[PDB]
């Protein structure tokens, strides 16, 4: 298959800043990926942010910013209030070289 791993629960900041690393592993060695943050609203889905970047290059997005080092993306999200206590899913898409790959994280949980 394809593997995406993200922390089970994170504790957000006193200013609304939550961060953690999302990790992917695959059969290939891809050079262009799209990392997408989603929020699970009980049974629906929201695109929090997304960025198509290439390896080495800037992870350019917004209320999100990012840096990748290998297959780890240090995802930073600023401005989350106590009302955002919900599930944040890490979606990773490997664009090039072919083939495309989809991996979806088991979930990460933020508390504010």
């Amino acid at each position, epitope marked *: 298959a394809m593997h995406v791993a993200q922390p089970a629960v994170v504790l957000a900041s006193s200013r609304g800043i939550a961060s953690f690393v999302c990790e992917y592993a695959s059969p290939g060695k891809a050079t262009e990926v799209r990392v997408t943050v989603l929020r699970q609203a009980d049974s629906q889905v929201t695109e929090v942010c997304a960025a198509t970047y290439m390896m080495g290059n800037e992870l350019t997005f917004s209320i999100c910013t990012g840096t990748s080092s290998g297959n780890q993306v240090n995802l930073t999200i600023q401005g989350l209030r106590a009302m955002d206590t919900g599930l944040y899913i890490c979606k990773v898409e490997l664009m*090039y070289p072919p083939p495309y790959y989809l991996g979806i994280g088991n979930g990460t949980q933020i508390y504010v």
Partner: antibody
Amino acid sequence: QVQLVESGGGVVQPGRSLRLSCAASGFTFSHYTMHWVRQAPGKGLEWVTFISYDGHNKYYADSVKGRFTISRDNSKNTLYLQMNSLRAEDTAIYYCARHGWLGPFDYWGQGTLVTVSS
Amino acid sequence: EIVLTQSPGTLSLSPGERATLSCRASQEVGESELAWYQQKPGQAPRLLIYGAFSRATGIPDRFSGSGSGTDFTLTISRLEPEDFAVYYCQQYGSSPWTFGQGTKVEIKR
């Protein structure tokens, strides 16, 4: 409601071209990658092509590699399939389909018939 | 390409019975990478279930999926009249997106 509406289907002579278009409405078309999937008469569903929300990433089924190009216009909420060098086996109902944010094709137009024949 | 193969071609059941349809991958597909679609004659197909436990909007809970790796199944716990149709599986974890060749659920009489 999400609604997808294909146009431009009809009869084509082998080796000639045809451009289908899909008119999207009811969602932020700008926000979704889109696909074409086709169905030859009597047979199953065959994926044809993929286009990312911004048009930077495309993928094609090998049976249409080189002959089809996908495109979209976001100002018009329209997805396009440009089919060149058509052959009898490209005869099918062509569906336009939205790639759901979680993996599958969650919304399908009702399809347009493309008949390649002399 | 990940080739998907379905079984049986036609499943013959009476309303109220339970239907188990099969989908087989040529490679190991992740349980959360499969989708099922329903199609009725002359209509576009629509999405039923996908992922490991997820279900598309308005699909009822008699529709449910399982299986790991190579052998997947769609269970229709109690067949309603509106459920006699053709069903297609599809994997969406890697490209190309590939479909099974369909299983018809026909009324046995």
